Design a protein around this ligand. Structure first.
Ligand SMILES: *[C@@H]1O[C@H](CO)[C@@H](O[C@@H]2O[C@H](CO)[C@@H](O[C@@H]3O[C@H](CO[C@H]4O[C@H](CO)[C@@H](O)[C@H](O[C@H]5O[C@H](CO)[C@@H](O)[C@H](O)[C@@H]5O[C@H]5O[C@H](CO)[C@@H](O)[C@H](O)[C@@H]5O)[C@@H]4O)[C@@H](O)[C@H](O[C@H]4O[C@H](CO)[C@@H](O)[C@H](O)[C@@H]4O[C@H]4O[C@H](CO)[C@@H](O)[C@H](O)[C@@H]4O)[C@@H]3O)[C@H](O)[C@H]2NC(C)=O)[C@H](O)[C@H]1NC(C)=O
Ligand code: XUI
Ligand code: CA
Ligand code: CA
Ligand code: NA
Ligand code: NA
Ligand code: ZN
Length: 804
């Protein structure tokens, strides 16, 4: 109940919402149907439209008007945005030459440059080039300020998850807005874009920027807008708030546009009907900039022009129906469209079984346009599993397609565009431009992820960010000033450096090796290798730091270095360099089943071969590949028990092809590569290193833990004219986190030769170095010649494998 018979007189667009049942006059009152009776008359004036004209100049103030052209309007802060142009002979902001903003040029009383975030729904990255002739204000922001060619949204590429990620710096699994529609089984409640459940604060986790600001004494209202307030009124409201007295004036403002998304769903991303919405958004940017110019704020405020996601061609004929795969379709609930989420229709149905649903949806049709996953099996780069609102069964939908439960859902529900797909898909990429005194001038920056922007907005406002998933400092290169200068994290565990401490006969591991193969010259040589004489070749960027408490040993060898965990009985990391000239060899016949005790490491802290013999499901692989040994003699080191890791035979197919074929291909293409590989344990799918007591699976009868994934980080010189091991400047990286699965059901073509499917798998599981850091508690690139912020940028890089 609202007592709507209070009044908005002197209260229009108040920033502090008032409490029920009192009537409201803030920018969200319409959403709650709680505005006072006179809100439209007083706060939504439209008389005489939005523009000054020659005849209005110097008019007697008429309080009925939408905006003013009387002489007093500048001091009232309520001129139409083109007032000075029409009436005072000024130019539009867009017609002024760009001039570098070296310092804030702000009116007296301004404590800091204000931040204005201008969010555009569905603004696909390629609009910035393709629409540039019809968007001159946006083109001036872009060309004169700091821009990226695109910005990567989060998955799913839907509105609410991305806008709330922009506000919090958090992945959707952590802030809790995991889709535009959600069911929370603990609350037993549902969230939808339409309706009121979404007003309940219990859905919205993390700390959005307006709360971060408010807590730290910086004034800031929410970034939401009632859809029915026209854009011209939103702009005039912002300009009015900027005219408040110093003690009352916010420091952060948000404008939101529902375009071009609204039209893009109707017409497709490049429908001829799309030109006019792009023109109208550009006109709104022009109103804002002219308005700022009038207030002498156009060289004071920092403006961010940012989108939530792009838009793809999608029509209802490209729909897959679950009723064509499942006999039991009425026993499931599907959240449909550009992603699928499946759960049981009834919690009382004891015959519901996820394994049978997954199997019925796996590789059933030749050109099947979706792929089912248990959520823990989704690519780790999506960070889309650790929330009870995310159903266990997920469908990754191909770009341009939908999935639905039954055909009647699609015709008893027009459209030509949609979004929501994998966030690496080119059509889903969106936009970032920063313009103002704190951003750089005429500067292009590489693409980056939208999770990084919260920290930068905190930096722009002098705020300490709440804990988030950005890597603070990784976007320092966007900024002229206010950079954040992080220190590297402190190493928590220092390594042991064991020498030869055990005799062969102390081992009873059930292993064998034909290595009894028969010199002062070359014996000192082998000793030096074990002491670390080649370490500068194979550990190019320092050893990784271990950021938690544990017991581990550094082991040196001719061809590779490793950090060996006495707790997990395997390396945490193994590092090796492969030059462009390196030669690939075979595992010799006499060494096929060779495993050798490591006399530096106790039998008690070693794996054993008998466990692998007994475990009929589990085999083993090696982290440093024997195929890339530098010599027949060095090859023996590759068969050390301390280089062994547990591997399902299905996974060994993947791993062997990567090691035998792809590493050398990369070294050939990149002029040498340095590779760091290792295991990952994430049994609770939280994206974070498991402790020993979280491990759900061991090699049968043993204490050897089974990794959930295997990673590799492959580094070389950005200037590929220099070899990876003699690189003078910036680095180039690609990484992956491959799921360690006992089948290749994910790869529908896995019956074919590995050259037809393995690299496709690896691309799907591409990762940032930062993702591996979270998953391992290791910190890489500790010893380089590069600035720490540059290294943070490198750790956030994702190699996406999309075309231009
Ligand atoms: C991305 O960045 C974020 C932000 O840094 C990272 O997330 C943090 O990760 C931490 C570890 O997972 C986690 O720390 C836990 O916090 C518990 C207190 O949590 C509440 O308070 C905080 C602070 O205000 C708040 O933010 C939380 O918000 C979550 O929960 C509400 C729902 O109530 C949601 O609205 C909100 O969206 C958010 O949900 C997300 O996080 C929770 C986990 O907290 C998930 O379950 C959700 O699915 C969702 O992802 C909370 O309101 C604290 O109690 C925990 O401590 C327990 O565990 C530690 C382990 O160190 C142990 O030492 C303690 O003893 C304790 O154990 C006891 O409880 C156990 C569980 O019941 C029990 O089993 C034991 O036996 C013990 O009794 C823990 O410290 C932190 O909350 C989140 N923060 C956020 C915002 O998500 C994230 O990791 C980053 N991602 C990557 C990939 O890097
Ligand atoms: O603006 C709209 C549509 N719209 C319109 N009217 C609304 C009225 C109320 C509320 N609620 C206020 C109380 N509320 C909260 O206070 C929670 C959010 C932060 C912590 C508590 C829960 C949410 C949300 C909306 C809303 O979405 N869409 C654009 C947009 C802009 C910024 C962001 Cl971040 C997002 Cl996700 C979406
Ligand atoms: Ca959107
Ligand atoms: Ca974990
Ligand atoms: Na076995
Ligand atoms: Na397969
Ligand atoms: Zn949309």
């Amino acid at each position: 109940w609202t007592a709507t018979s209070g009044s908005c007189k002197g209260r229009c667009f108040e920033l502090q919402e008032v409490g029920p049942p009192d009537c409201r006059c803030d920018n969200l009152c319409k959403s709650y149907s709680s505005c006072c009776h006179d809100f439209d008359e007083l706060c939504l004036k439209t008389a005489r439209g939005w523009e000054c004209t020659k005849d209005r100049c110097g008019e007697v103030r008429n309080e009925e008007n939408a905006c003013h052209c009387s002489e007093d309007c500048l001091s009232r802060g309520d001129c139409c945005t083109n007032y000075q142009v029409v009436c005072k002979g000024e130019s539009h902001w867009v017609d002024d030459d760009c001039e570098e903003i070296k310092v804030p040029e702000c009116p007296a009383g301004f404590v800091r440059p204000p931040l204005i975030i201008f969010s555009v729904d569905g603004f696909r990255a390629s609009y910035m080039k393709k629409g540039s002739k019809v968007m001159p204000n946006i083109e001036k922001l872009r060309s004169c300020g700091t821009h990226a060619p695109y910005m990567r949204p989060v998955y799913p590429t839907k509105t609410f998850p991305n806008l709330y990620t922009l506000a919090t710096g958090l992945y959707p699994e952590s802030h809790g807005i995991v889709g535009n529609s959600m069911y929370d089984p603990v609350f037993d409640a549902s969230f939808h874009l339409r309706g009121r459940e979404k007003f309940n604060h219990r859905w919205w986790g993390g700390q959005p920027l307006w709360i971060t600001a408010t807590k730290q004494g910086v004034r800031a209202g929410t970034f939401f807008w009632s859809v029915s307030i026209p854009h011209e009124r939103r702009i005039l409201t912002i300009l009015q708030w900027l005219s408040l007295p110093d003690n009352e004036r916010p420091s952060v403002y948000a404008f939101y546009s529902e375009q071009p998304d609204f039209s893009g769903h109707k017409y497709g991303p490049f429908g001829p009907e799309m030109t006019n919405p792009l023109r109208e958004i550009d006109k709104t940017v022009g109103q804002l900039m002219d308005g700022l110019k009038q207030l002498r704020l156009h060289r004071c405020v920092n403006v961010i022009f940012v989108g939530d996601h792009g838009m793809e061609d999608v029509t209802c004929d490209r729909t897959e129906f679950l009723s064509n795969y499942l006999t039991n379709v009425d026993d499931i609930t599907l959240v449909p469209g550009t992603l699928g989420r499946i759960r049981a229709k009834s919690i009382n149905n004891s015959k519901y079984d996820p394994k049978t649903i997954i199997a019925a949806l796996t590789c059933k049709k030749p050109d099947q346009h979706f792929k089912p996953y248990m959520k823990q099996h989704l690519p780790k780069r999506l960070h889309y599993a650790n929330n009870r609102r995310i159903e266990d069964i997920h469908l990754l939908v191909d770009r341009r397609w939908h999935v639905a439960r039954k055909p009647l859902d699609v015709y008893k529900k027009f459209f030509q565009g949609d979004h929501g797909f994998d966030n690496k898909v080119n059509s889903m990429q969106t936009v970032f431009v920063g313009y103002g005194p704190t951003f750089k001038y005429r500067t292009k920056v590489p693409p980056f992820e939208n999770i990084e922007l919260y920290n930068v907005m905190c930096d722009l406002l002098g705020l300490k960010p709440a804990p988030n998933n950005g890597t603070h400092g990784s976007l320092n290169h966007l900024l002229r000033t206010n950079t954040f200068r992080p220190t590297m994290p402190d190493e928590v565990s220092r390594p042991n450096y064991p020498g030869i401490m055990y005799l062969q006969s102390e081992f009873d591991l059930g292993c064998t090796c034909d290595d009894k193969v028969e010199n002062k010259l070359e014996e000192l040589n082998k000793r030096l290798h074990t002491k670390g004489s080649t370490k500068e070749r194979h550990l190019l960027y320092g050893r990784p730091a271990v950021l938690y408490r544990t017991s581990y040993d550094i082991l040196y060898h001719t061809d590779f270095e490793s950090g060996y965990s006495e707790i997990f009985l395997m390396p945490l990391w193994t590092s090796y360099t492969i030059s462009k000239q390196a030669e690939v060899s075979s595992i010799p016949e006499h060494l096929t089943n060779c495993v050798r005790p490591d006399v530096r490491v106790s039998p008690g802290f070693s794996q054993n071969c008998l466990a692998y013999k007994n475990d009929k499901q589990m085999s083993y692989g090696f982290l440093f590949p024997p195929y890339l040994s530098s010599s027949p003699e060095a090859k023996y080191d590759a068969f050390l028990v301390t280089n062994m890791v547990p591997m399902y035979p299905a996974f060994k197919r993947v791993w062997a092809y990567f090691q035998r074929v792809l590493v050398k291909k990369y070294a050939s293409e990149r002029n040498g590569v340095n590779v760091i590989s290792g295991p990952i344990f994430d049994y609770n799918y939280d994206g974070l290193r498991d402790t020993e007591d979280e491990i759900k699976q061991y090699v049968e009868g043993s204490s050897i833990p089974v990794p959930t994934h295997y990673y590799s980080i492959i580094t070389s010189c950005l200037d590929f004219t220099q070899p990876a091991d003699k690189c003078d400047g910036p680095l180039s990286v690609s990484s992956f986190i491959l799921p360690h699965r006992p089948d290749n059901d994910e790869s529908c073509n896995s019956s074919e030769d590995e050259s037809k499917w393995v690299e496709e798998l690896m691309k799907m599981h591409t990762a940032r170095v930062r993702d591996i850091e979270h998953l391992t508690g290791l910190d890489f690139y500790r010893k380089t010649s590069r600035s720490y912020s540059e290294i943070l940028t490198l750790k956030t890089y994702l190699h996406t494998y999309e075309s231009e």
